[PDB]
Amino acid sequence: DPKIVNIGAVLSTKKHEQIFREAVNQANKRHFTRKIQLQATSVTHRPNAIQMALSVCEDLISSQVYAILVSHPPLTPTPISYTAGFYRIPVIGLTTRMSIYSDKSIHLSFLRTVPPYSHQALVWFEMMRLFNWNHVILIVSDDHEGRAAQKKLETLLEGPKADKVLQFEPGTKNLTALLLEAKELEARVIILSASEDDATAVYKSAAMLDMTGAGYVWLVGEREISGSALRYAPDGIIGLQLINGKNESAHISDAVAVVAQAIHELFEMENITDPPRGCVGNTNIWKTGPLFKRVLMSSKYPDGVTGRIEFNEDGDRKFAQYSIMNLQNRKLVQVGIFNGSYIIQNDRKIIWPGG
Amino acid sequence: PPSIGIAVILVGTSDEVAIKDLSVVPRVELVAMNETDPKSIITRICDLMSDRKIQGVVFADDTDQEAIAQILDFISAQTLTPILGIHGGSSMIMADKDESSMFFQFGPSIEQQASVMLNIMEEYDWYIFSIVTTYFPGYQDFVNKIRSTIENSFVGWELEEVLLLDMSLDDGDSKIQNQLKKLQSPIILLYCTKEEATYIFEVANSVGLTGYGYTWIVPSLVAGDTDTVPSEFPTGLISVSYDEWDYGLPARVRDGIAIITTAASDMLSEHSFIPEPKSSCYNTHEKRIYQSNMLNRYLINVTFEGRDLSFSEDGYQMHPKLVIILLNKERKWERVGKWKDKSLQMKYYVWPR
Amino acid sequence: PSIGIAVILVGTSDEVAIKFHHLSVVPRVELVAMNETDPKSIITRICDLMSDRKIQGVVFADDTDQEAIAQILDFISAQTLTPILGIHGGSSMIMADKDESSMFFQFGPSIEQQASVMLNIMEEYDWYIFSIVTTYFPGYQDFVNKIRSTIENSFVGWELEEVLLLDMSLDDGDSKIQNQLKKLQSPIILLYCTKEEATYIFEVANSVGLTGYGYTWIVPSLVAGDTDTVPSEFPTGLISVSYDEWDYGLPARVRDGIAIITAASDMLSEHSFIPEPKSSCYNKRIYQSNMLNRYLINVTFEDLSFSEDGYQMHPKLVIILLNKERKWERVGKWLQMKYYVWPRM
Ligand SMILES: *[C@@H]1O[C@H](CO)[C@@H](O[C@@H]2O[C@H](CO)[C@@H](O[C@@H]3O[C@H](CO[C@H]4O[C@H](CO)[C@@H](O)[C@H](O)[C@@H]4O)[C@@H](O)[C@H](O[C@H]4O[C@H](CO)[C@@H](O)[C@H](O)[C@@H]4O)[C@@H]3O)[C@H](O)[C@H]2NC(C)=O)[C@H](O[C@H]2O[C@@H](C)[C@@H](O)[C@@H](O)[C@@H]2O)[C@H]1NC(C)=O
Ligand SMILES: C[C@@H]([C@H](O)c1ccc(O)cc1)N1CCC(Cc2ccccc2)CC1
Ligand SMILES: C[C@@H]([C@H](O)c1ccc(O)cc1)N1CCC(Cc2ccccc2)CC1
Ligand SMILES: *[C@@H]1O[C@H](CO)[C@@H](O)[C@H](O)[C@H]1NC(C)=O
Ligand SMILES: *[C@H]1O[C@H](CO)[C@@H](O)[C@H](O)[C@H]1NC(C)=O
Ligand SMILES: *[C@H]1O[C@H](CO)[C@@H](O)[C@H](O)[C@H]1NC(C)=O
Ligand SMILES: *[C@H]1O[C@H](CO)[C@@H](O)[C@H](O)[C@H]1NC(C)=O
Ligand SMILES: *[C@H]1O[C@H](CO)[C@@H](O)[C@H](O)[C@H]1NC(C)=O
Ligand code: NA
């Protein structure tokens, strides 16, 4: 018999649990499994953060999982990351895009198969070269996510330059003050990073100050053309959607493939120890945890359902693909894709604000 | 007068006898606890909370596990219960506690320890130095506190290197070694955890950076329990330390109970009510419209027995009494200085070999 | 977030005509019907609705003239620290001296404003000479003192002839009340008492010849009560100050009482919490506070605020005359009067 290596997962529904089970079963089939064979162990999300942490211990770590897949339920992955990070058991985020999970101090062994919101800056930057927008105003919310997008785009800029970056307190409903400071500047390209409800506040103010018509360009992310942010969004806005970013099934499939590969690569090495069995009375890290993480971080899976899977230095997905969306006659229209490294414009014409 | 439940949790060999000696009055109940992993700690508190009406929690432990502080902070924030880490890992400074934390720790802030370090350096005219940290939370507070003290001084400070070490990966690529081999300064400030330090020191030695010519200064949480000295710690190691000497456990539990009681009192006597202790952790998602951070404003400013036992919002102590310790040749930690009120008074004029 | 609000309706009610939130909390309203109005019934119904859904407030409307309902609600409110709005019927009949811990508020003018109005009606038609007649019904002192302190300020030259205090807590075998009334000379008499009390007083007054031409009685809201219920003993020519169901109907009130309670938003938005509804009436007091009041009192919707006394700051008052055809007729608005010469009644 082979050594049975458990992989864990906290997923949304029993249906997705069955997909995980089936992905692992296929990994066993496609891999040579005389020495090591994977076993799937999963639960669905608990109603609160304390019960979730306890579930991690009683249901998963009790089975010595080498890794834990985690999705966004239908209540963040945080309790799962803390508990698993206590032991240095790696966590693979399947659907969270919050930038906070890219911070090694808090999330020690966290990788994800989707990029953080702030990486949208990579697309904006490619978009600025293409349409030759050399002068831009950046407007971000003054919270972690807003600041992440700013740091990330400033990095790419330091060619095209940011003329000023304006920041606003999240939850503020009258931004006429903030926006009048940007009207007075020359540059008419405006990049926005904000949650749904803050984008709404900006769009309204923007409009009442008549900054949404001919001459002005608005470049935005996914949150800013989602749900309510769409109800008041000006026409001609350009926005982004992460392709498959919400397909839990696709991400389970890919995460399991990367993890199976990494497990097998790990057992090609020596002095691999098992994870702790259960939480109670165990306070030492899993000695092989940091090595398993290194192997994962540098895994490369080319033929992924969600594209080309590689991780960057923070364990964030690289080579993500985006739909480039333009709001035309109040409809979201795909005018292109960012394919991982290249902008590809399709036959549908961009209508700019005004037009 | 009405009674508030105060659970006092003692982990490890403790003297309960010595330990067990306002508009509202405390009903203490000492509870022991054997384990300090996340399930044990979450469970013992959630059970303690479903039996009695615990209004606050005083936590002491006998370990060097800084993770305990983070476990508690999470519990405190999830259930909106005050928790005081008065001793052990529970008191190892935690940076960036939750927005809704009611977790407070007996000990100096990261920034103050860093200030204390620069005071030591100025006294012995050690002006040239380098910094090594890991990603352990606080490291930025540490590096920035140094950087802006330096920047704002008419003193010839010179920061030669700042290294950042990634302890989340294995070191089979010899990365840590190749970073360490870049240091030149005779003083090195190290910010990381105790378990991390023992690995770093083992490596620095293999690279000739531990002996004479190199002085390492380190924070309270690296020293941890002074009766547990990893063999890889270099002789001559300097450390700040919360004075467990003159301020023992039974004293700390005293002030612990005082702060939760004084705080409660102050708040009934200005609001005619006190936050009702949630009887369950399994229910904190619904019940949260009805729960509040409110006691924080009082927990933070308690004067007791003419001592100012107050906290910062960041959840560390305002005026900790600190001791500067030096690891001697017999590998025992030796007291060599006191920090009182922004005032450092050392023992030696010339530094010991 | 969602907060439960019980709208209780006694007797006849158009429950279909009765049935938004930009605010920080959302009302999960439940329309509840109650048959009887004795203390047990009202206490039993409210307590049980509380040991079910979590009730952050109550909106209460009855049809009856029973001013006791207000008193029962104040008691229930103070005991369980649950806000209660008395918006219609007996529950809105002003309660004087509500409990300190009370979270009970009523739609209607204060005793003090009603007395202020009556003196205005008086000044309008130059009725400067009068008497007062109260029973011991709470607020009688509030009433008299407001009249007395207003006159003393005035150069209008008022003359208060008699002030009678009628003990309606004893029987009338000695015909004591008949004799107290026989003492009245003045052409205007201001009467403060309950509806059921007034019907008695009037009968005794009709017997001593004080109700015809040349004697005019002015009576507060709770005497008039429901205007579709007129006791035969009420003297034709009765002047009252009512709280109009004429421009502010039940459904309007019930909507406004939910806008008041849905307070919760204000307190949540500032203290990131709201009081946990008394799971029961079987209690553990160091925990509940009075904190919500400060907010229930300052609610601006489309100015709905109260006094801490528990009455509306800005109620619209209609002056009514009981006429020869014996229906209550609107003859003023609060002061603008329909008539310039007071008609003979
Ligand atoms: C996103 O979009 C980009 C751009 O379209 C794409 O990257 C290009 O992919 C093509 C096709 O794989 C690469 O092509 C071959 O190009 C070489 C030589 O190229 C050099 O000059 C070009 C043009 O100036 C430069 O762009 C390059 O930097 C080089 O300097 C050529 O010799 C070659 O041909 C032989 O093989 C052919 C088929 O492959 C065959 O038809 C022929 O007869 C020859 O025997 C190709 O035509 C191209 O170089 C890439 N461009 C850039 C800028 O990198 C991304 O695609 C890749 O991702 C996956 C799917 C694989 O297809 C990879 O091999 C590609 O690298 C695309 N990304 C995604 C995720 O789809
Ligand atoms: C992520 C590390 C950490 O902060 C750290 C340690 C060393 C570093 O070099 C860098 C970071 N933590 C995460 C949380 C863990 C505690 C926990 C477990 C379950 C629930 C709540 C809280 C304890 C360890
Ligand atoms: C004392 C009278 C009253 O105020 C009154 C009536 C006529 C007067 O001339 C003078 C006074 N009340 C007392 C309370 C009663 C209602 C009640 C029952 C149970 C619990 C709380 C409240 C209703 C009758
Ligand atoms: C999601 O991905 C799976 C691939 O496993 C695919 O079968 C399904 O059609 C996808 N659904 C969407 C939303 O495209
Ligand atoms: C926990 O372990 C200690 C140490 O052996 C023991 O004395 C204590 O009684 C244990 N707890 C219980 C409930 O027995
Ligand atoms: C804390 O308590 C003191 C002592 O009564 C009080 O005077 C002071 O206002 C408070 N200090 C703060 C935090 O402002
Ligand atoms: C009103 O409800 C009560 C309580 O069940 C019941 O006893 C009574 O018969 C009902 N009357 C009507 C109007 O249906
Ligand atoms: C109500 O009263 C407060 C306190 O006087 C006042 O400052 C505030 O403007 C008012 N609140 C609202 C709802 O506007
Ligand atoms: Na990561």
Coordinates of C-alpha atoms in Angstrom, one line a residue, chain C residues 13-340:
Chain C
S13 CA -58.5 48.4 11.8
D14 CA -58.0 48.6 8.0
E15 CA -54.9 46.3 8.0
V16 CA -54.6 46.4 4.2
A17 CA -54.5 50.2 4.0
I18 CA -51.7 50.2 6.6
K19 CA -49.0 48.1 4.9
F20 CA -38.2 53.1 2.7
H21 CA -34.8 52.3 4.3
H22 CA -31.8 54.3 3.2
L23 CA -30.9 54.1 6.9
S24 CA -28.5 51.7 8.7
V25 CA -31.2 49.2 9.8
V26 CA -34.4 47.7 8.3
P27 CA -37.8 47.3 10.0
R28 CA -39.2 43.8 9.9
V29 CA -42.8 44.9 10.8
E30 CA -45.4 42.5 12.1
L31 CA -49.1 43.6 12.4
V32 CA -50.7 42.2 15.5
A33 CA -54.3 42.3 16.5
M34 CA -55.5 42.4 20.1
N35 CA -59.1 41.9 21.3
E36 CA -59.3 42.9 24.9
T37 CA -57.8 45.9 26.7
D38 CA -57.6 45.0 30.4
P39 CA -54.1 45.0 32.2
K40 CA -53.7 41.3 31.9
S41 CA -54.6 41.1 28.2
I42 CA -52.2 44.0 27.3
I43 CA -49.4 42.7 29.5
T44 CA -49.9 39.1 28.4
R45 CA -49.9 39.9 24.7
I46 CA -46.8 42.2 24.8
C47 CA -44.7 39.9 26.9
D48 CA -45.4 36.9 24.7
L49 CA -44.7 38.7 21.5
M50 CA -41.4 39.5 23.2
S51 CA -40.7 35.9 24.1
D52 CA -40.9 35.2 20.4
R53 CA -39.5 37.5 17.8
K54 CA -36.9 40.0 19.2
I55 CA -38.9 43.3 19.5
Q56 CA -36.9 46.5 19.5
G57 CA -40.1 48.6 19.7
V58 CA -43.9 48.6 19.8
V59 CA -46.4 50.8 17.9
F60 CA -49.7 50.8 19.6
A61 CA -53.2 51.9 18.4
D62 CA -56.7 51.3 19.9
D63 CA -60.1 52.7 19.1
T64 CA -61.4 52.9 22.7
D65 CA -61.6 55.9 24.9
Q66 CA -59.8 54.2 27.8
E67 CA -57.0 56.5 29.0
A68 CA -55.8 53.7 31.2
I69 CA -54.2 52.0 28.2
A70 CA -51.6 54.7 28.2
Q71 CA -50.9 54.0 31.9
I72 CA -50.6 50.3 31.3
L73 CA -48.2 50.9 28.4
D74 CA -46.0 53.2 30.5
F75 CA -45.7 50.5 33.1
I76 CA -44.9 47.8 30.6
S77 CA -42.4 50.1 28.9
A78 CA -40.6 51.0 32.1
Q79 CA -40.5 47.4 33.3
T80 CA -39.0 45.9 30.1
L81 CA -37.1 48.9 28.8
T82 CA -38.9 48.5 25.4
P83 CA -39.8 51.7 23.5
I84 CA -43.5 52.0 23.1
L85 CA -45.4 54.6 20.9
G86 CA -49.0 55.4 21.8
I87 CA -50.3 56.8 18.6
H88 CA -54.2 56.5 18.6
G89 CA -57.1 56.0 21.0
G90 CA -56.7 55.5 24.7
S91 CA -52.9 54.9 24.3
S92 CA -52.5 58.5 23.0
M93 CA -54.4 60.1 25.9
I94 CA -51.7 62.2 27.5
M95 CA -50.1 60.5 30.5
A96 CA -48.8 62.9 33.1
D97 CA -45.7 62.0 35.1
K98 CA -44.5 58.9 33.2
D99 CA -41.9 56.7 34.9
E100 CA -38.3 57.8 34.9
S101 CA -37.2 54.6 33.2
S102 CA -40.1 54.9 30.8
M103 CA -39.6 54.6 27.0
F104 CA -43.2 55.4 26.3
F105 CA -44.1 58.3 23.9
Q106 CA -47.5 59.5 22.7
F107 CA -48.9 61.3 19.7
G108 CA -50.6 64.4 21.0
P109 CA -50.1 67.8 22.7
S110 CA -48.9 68.1 26.3
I111 CA -51.4 69.1 29.0
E112 CA -49.4 72.3 29.1
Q113 CA -49.9 73.1 25.4
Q114 CA -53.6 72.3 25.6
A115 CA -54.0 74.8 28.4
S116 CA -52.0 77.3 26.3
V117 CA -54.4 76.8 23.5
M118 CA -57.5 77.2 25.6
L119 CA -56.3 80.6 26.9
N120 CA -55.8 81.5 23.2
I121 CA -59.4 80.6 22.3
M122 CA -60.3 82.7 25.3
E123 CA -58.3 85.8 24.3
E124 CA -59.7 85.5 20.8
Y125 CA -63.3 86.1 21.9
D126 CA -62.4 88.2 24.9
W127 CA -63.4 85.6 27.5
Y128 CA -61.3 86.9 30.4
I129 CA -63.3 85.7 33.3
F130 CA -63.5 82.0 34.3
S131 CA -63.3 79.0 36.6
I132 CA -61.4 75.8 36.5
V133 CA -62.7 72.3 37.4
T134 CA -60.4 69.3 37.7
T135 CA -60.6 65.9 39.2
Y136 CA -57.5 64.2 40.6
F137 CA -56.6 62.7 37.3
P138 CA -52.8 63.0 36.8
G139 CA -51.9 66.3 35.2
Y140 CA -54.6 68.3 37.0
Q141 CA -51.7 70.2 38.7
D142 CA -49.9 70.5 35.4
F143 CA -53.1 72.1 34.0
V144 CA -53.9 74.5 36.8
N145 CA -50.3 75.8 37.2
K146 CA -49.9 76.5 33.5
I147 CA -53.1 78.5 33.6
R148 CA -52.0 80.2 36.8
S149 CA -48.5 81.1 35.6
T150 CA -49.8 82.5 32.3
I151 CA -52.3 84.8 33.9
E152 CA -49.7 86.2 36.2
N153 CA -47.5 87.1 33.3
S154 CA -50.4 88.8 31.6
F155 CA -51.7 92.4 31.4
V156 CA -54.8 91.0 29.7
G157 CA -56.6 91.3 33.0
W158 CA -57.8 87.7 33.4
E159 CA -59.9 86.8 36.5
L160 CA -59.9 83.3 37.8
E161 CA -62.9 83.0 40.0
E162 CA -63.0 79.5 41.4
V163 CA -60.8 76.5 41.1
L164 CA -62.5 73.3 42.1
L165 CA -60.9 69.9 42.8
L166 CA -63.4 67.0 42.6
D167 CA -62.6 63.8 44.4
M168 CA -64.0 61.2 42.0
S169 CA -62.6 58.3 44.0
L170 CA -65.5 58.3 46.4
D171 CA -69.2 57.7 45.7
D172 CA -71.7 60.6 45.6
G173 CA -74.2 59.8 48.3
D174 CA -73.7 63.0 50.1
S175 CA -74.1 64.8 46.8
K176 CA -70.7 66.5 47.6
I177 CA -70.0 67.2 44.0
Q178 CA -73.4 68.9 43.4
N179 CA -72.5 71.3 46.1
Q180 CA -69.0 72.1 44.8
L181 CA -70.4 72.9 41.4
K182 CA -73.1 75.2 42.9
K183 CA -70.2 77.5 43.8
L184 CA -69.5 78.4 40.1
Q185 CA -70.5 81.8 38.8
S186 CA -68.2 82.5 35.8
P187 CA -69.4 82.2 32.2
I188 CA -66.4 80.1 31.1
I189 CA -65.5 76.9 32.8
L190 CA -62.3 75.0 31.9
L191 CA -62.7 71.3 32.8
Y192 CA -59.8 68.8 33.2
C193 CA -60.8 65.1 33.9
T194 CA -61.3 61.9 32.0
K195 CA -64.1 61.3 29.5
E196 CA -66.0 58.9 31.8
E197 CA -65.5 61.4 34.6
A198 CA -66.7 64.3 32.5
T199 CA -70.0 62.5 31.6
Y200 CA -70.7 62.4 35.4
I201 CA -69.7 66.0 36.1
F202 CA -71.9 67.2 33.2
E203 CA -75.0 65.3 34.4
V204 CA -74.6 66.9 37.8
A205 CA -74.0 70.3 36.1
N206 CA -77.1 69.9 33.9
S207 CA -79.0 69.4 37.2
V208 CA -77.7 72.6 38.7
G209 CA -78.3 74.6 35.6
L210 CA -74.8 75.2 34.4
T211 CA -74.8 73.8 30.8
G212 CA -77.1 76.1 28.8
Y213 CA -76.5 79.4 27.1
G214 CA -74.3 81.7 29.1
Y215 CA -72.1 78.8 30.4
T216 CA -69.4 77.6 28.1
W217 CA -67.2 74.6 29.0
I218 CA -63.8 74.1 27.5
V219 CA -62.4 70.6 27.7
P220 CA -59.0 68.9 26.7
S221 CA -58.5 66.3 24.1
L222 CA -59.0 63.2 26.3
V223 CA -62.5 64.4 27.3
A224 CA -63.7 64.6 23.7
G225 CA -61.8 61.4 23.0
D226 CA -63.3 59.6 20.0
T227 CA -65.6 62.1 18.3
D228 CA -67.8 59.4 16.8
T229 CA -68.8 58.6 20.4
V230 CA -70.7 61.4 22.0
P231 CA -72.1 60.8 25.5
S232 CA -75.7 62.2 25.6
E233 CA -74.8 64.2 28.7
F234 CA -72.2 66.4 26.9
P235 CA -73.6 69.9 26.8
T236 CA -74.3 71.2 23.3
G237 CA -71.8 74.0 22.8
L238 CA -68.9 72.0 24.3
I239 CA -65.6 73.3 23.1
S240 CA -62.7 70.8 22.9
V241 CA -59.2 70.6 21.7
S242 CA -58.7 67.4 19.7
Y243 CA -55.9 65.6 18.0
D244 CA -57.2 65.4 14.5
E245 CA -57.7 62.1 12.8
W246 CA -58.9 64.4 10.0
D247 CA -55.5 65.2 8.5
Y248 CA -53.3 62.6 10.2
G249 CA -54.9 59.1 9.9
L250 CA -54.0 55.8 11.4
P251 CA -51.9 54.6 8.5
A252 CA -50.0 57.9 8.4
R253 CA -49.4 57.6 12.2
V254 CA -48.4 53.9 12.0
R255 CA -45.9 54.7 9.2
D256 CA -44.5 57.6 11.3
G257 CA -44.2 55.4 14.4
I258 CA -42.1 52.9 12.5
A259 CA -40.0 55.8 11.2
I260 CA -39.5 56.9 14.8
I261 CA -38.3 53.5 16.1
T262 CA -36.3 52.6 12.9
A263 CA -33.8 55.8 16.5
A264 CA -32.2 52.4 16.2
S265 CA -30.2 53.5 13.1
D266 CA -29.0 56.7 14.8
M267 CA -27.7 54.8 17.9
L268 CA -26.2 52.0 15.8
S269 CA -24.4 54.5 13.6
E270 CA -22.8 56.1 16.6
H271 CA -22.3 53.4 19.2
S272 CA -22.1 50.4 16.8
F273 CA -24.8 48.6 18.8
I274 CA -28.5 48.6 19.9
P275 CA -30.0 47.2 23.1
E276 CA -30.8 43.5 23.1
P277 CA -34.6 43.2 23.3
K278 CA -35.8 41.8 26.6
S279 CA -36.0 38.1 25.8
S280 CA -38.7 38.0 28.5
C281 CA -40.5 39.8 31.3
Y282 CA -39.0 37.5 33.9
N283 CA -36.2 39.6 35.2
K284 CA -30.6 41.2 35.4
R285 CA -30.9 45.0 35.2
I286 CA -27.3 46.2 35.4
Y287 CA -27.3 45.4 31.7
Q288 CA -30.2 47.4 30.2
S289 CA -29.9 51.1 29.8
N290 CA -32.0 54.1 28.9
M291 CA -29.7 55.0 26.0
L292 CA -32.2 54.6 23.1
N293 CA -34.5 57.5 24.4
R294 CA -32.0 60.2 23.4
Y295 CA -32.6 59.1 19.8
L296 CA -36.3 58.3 19.8
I297 CA -36.8 61.9 20.8
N298 CA -34.9 63.6 17.9
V299 CA -36.2 61.7 14.9
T300 CA -36.5 63.8 11.7
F301 CA -38.2 61.9 8.8
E302 CA -39.8 64.3 6.3
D303 CA -39.8 67.1 12.7
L304 CA -41.2 64.2 14.7
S305 CA -39.4 64.9 17.9
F306 CA -40.8 64.6 21.5
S307 CA -40.3 66.0 24.9
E308 CA -38.6 63.7 27.5
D309 CA -42.1 63.9 29.0
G310 CA -43.4 61.8 26.2
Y311 CA -45.6 64.0 24.0
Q312 CA -45.1 65.4 20.5
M313 CA -43.3 68.7 20.2
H314 CA -45.2 69.8 17.1
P315 CA -48.7 68.3 16.9
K316 CA -51.4 69.9 14.8
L317 CA -54.5 70.7 16.9
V318 CA -58.0 71.2 15.7
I319 CA -60.5 73.1 17.8
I320 CA -63.9 71.5 17.8
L321 CA -67.4 72.5 18.9
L322 CA -70.2 70.1 19.8
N323 CA -73.2 71.5 18.0
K324 CA -77.0 71.5 18.0
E325 CA -77.1 68.6 15.5
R326 CA -74.7 67.0 18.1
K327 CA -71.8 66.1 15.8
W328 CA -68.3 67.5 16.6
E329 CA -67.5 70.3 14.2
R330 CA -64.1 71.8 13.3
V331 CA -64.1 75.5 14.1
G332 CA -60.4 76.2 14.5
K333 CA -56.7 75.2 13.7
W334 CA -53.6 75.5 15.9
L335 CA -54.4 80.0 16.4
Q336 CA -56.8 80.6 13.5
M337 CA -60.5 80.5 14.2
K338 CA -63.4 79.9 11.8
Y339 CA -65.6 82.4 13.6
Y340 CA -65.0 86.1 14.6

